Symmetry: D5
Subunit: 94 residues, 10 copies
């Protein structure tokens, strides 16, 4: 079932560099896995910002939680979660 | 191109089930075309979170303005860009 | 699974009549049922306010959505829904 | 009596050594006790955030305040306190 | 114990009659009794505003909330409740 | 004349030493003097938070400024000042 | 002593009819009076708004208050009041 | 198509030195190119602020996104993006 | 000189009549004049909204104010006015 | 023509030693100049804040921008600029 998840990314202004390589790499794989499995249904970029707007499809809140906590970006993320329900006036799937 | 659109519904107190109907055809046309790409309900609220997939701001503007609920809608629009981590599509 | 739900009541101005007492009652009985059956798990009044703050225990967002929409007070409410998850350091129920 | 308390954790990032291990365990132990003793009544994870929504059951504002001030995590917490009241529609115990 | 309470008044605009006069005078008498007995400890005007900042001294939240609910102006009030605690640097009485 | 002052404390993220204990006592010492003299009329603690909510009884905006300015904690405070006025429905003094 | 006072005017949407002239008339008369005597020290219009930004020069919060309350426009005004102190870096008068 | 974009600038206060002057030059040459091509249609300074308010004319969100991202200043920017539509009443070209 | 002026339109819900008729027409008439005379330099519609984001080019605040104060829609408008300055990075025209 | 300017000061928590005393003195002298020349028309301290509410009287947005830009405190200031217009009910100066 569906959640609207806004993420905003706050990489430490100075430092890491360039462990920034290891972290950005686990993040892109981790997000590819999650998208391949349908967990991470949709992924877009907020135009002009370092952050995404996503729709997750998971079985429960606890699942959504562990998935987000697992993200390599987590300690650097600001996350808003928002439960999505079916709309009567919908037509196809989703 | 994609827009994340939010529509909060307030209807006037002294005011109908034709509108829900009217809007539902408009919604269906648009969805059959694919420019009202996704329609969701915000759990607990009257109204949708929608993605729209149109060619111009002017297309989206007139399309949003065609909705019969429009005089009663609170609308926020956010542009959506392709993410480099994306796999599925869009 | 768990949602924290805030409900702020805004009952109509120069309207209602004897029907208000009927709406209050409709609402009070829908809520009793919902608590007996367990889906309206916890219910508290916000000190100094007309509304409630609640914990719901339902199977999906869709069930929650249908429950809130069924509430007679629904057209006069502002509603905030937040997903709750099992906390690693819990020692009791929930 | 009853309080709704939201807490958000902003721990120092690249700062902590195995001191980090000392505070987290220190916090789990204090929270376990407060839950065993009854004053930390409910404790939930805010889905996708380093945080909790909690309900504390204590006998004064000062007892709440002393309990919160005493949490190992306190210096890095953002805390919101909300008094809760009995809702006439409540079935069973608040 | 102590609460800081903010109240904002929004009476029906041109909608009342001999009713407004009764409503005002019943509120005035309610607040007087409450101050005379001491649960309504301090009461101030927010300068330039149709509002008050108050300190209530009551023994529970439920008691505060029944006090505020019983106010004739209650339906037309905007109310903020803040629990207050003892400051370790206080000279004399809270 | 009366002012509602909230002060939120945000000490250096250590960035502090045994100057810190020297500081907290300077503040304690100054707050003590001002309550004794009477311009710091009421002092309370925001439940769950590091700071205070207070009523100051001074003769001018200017004198309140100099008092707030002179607080040891000053450069670490976020302050709100709100003028309180005499409420017509006031029975006792304040 | 000095106050920055913002006033936002909001006259009944439809309504008012013929008295809208008398209200504005008395309003103009009252502000004229307060400026002459010097408690209404400065009066400026926020460009593009129906509403003013002013400085008042009065002896107390109560007197500020009695003045704002007596404006014909009061019931329709949203008001922010901010105490103003002499700036040590001032050269001239105020 | 048109977007109204707000950028606020936040350069790390230290330490930079000469490489700040190089940063500012690249930004300024990149902004010139963008304006000569037409993508950066209007640029104005927010009076009193290290910032700009701008109108972009690009073919798509993704084109807007890529231009904002390529800015030398981007890592120090706060950006608000607003899509702009044609107003029926317009007389000019835009 | 330049101002960024936002306008949000809020017509009364149970009103107008032939009143909506005259109003819009004279609104168009007035914006024609202001655009062709150049004081209303740019006029856009915010995508998905009723009202407009504009740039005014006038010679004083008093001029801007009499202009907006004169719009037929003024009693129904919410207006944000913000000064625009010349950005040193500009190439062609302000 | 006139502007209402809010300024709030956030000096580096510490990078200053008595270099800070230089900067305060420099800010003071620059402020002395602008006030003498009559551009900084009014200057008040916001009670309890390190800040000011000022009125600026300058021929253009560009003149005001350059002025605020030139203040020694600028990279530490947060500034609100608001245009001020002639008020019809005004009597004496401004």
């Amino acid at each position: 079932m569906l959640y609207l998840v806004r993420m905003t990314v706050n990489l430490p202004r100075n430092l890491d560099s360039r462990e920034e390589e290891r972290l950005k790499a686990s993040e892109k794989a981790r997000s590819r896995t999650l998208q391949e499995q349908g967990q991470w249904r949709y992924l877009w970029r907020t135009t002009g910002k370092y952050g995404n707007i996503s729709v997750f499809d998971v079985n429960s809140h606890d699942e959504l939680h562990e998935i987000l906590w697992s993200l390599p970006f987590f300690p650097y993320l600001t996350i808003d979660v928002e439960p999505l329900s079916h709309h009567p006036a919908r037509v196809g799937k989703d």
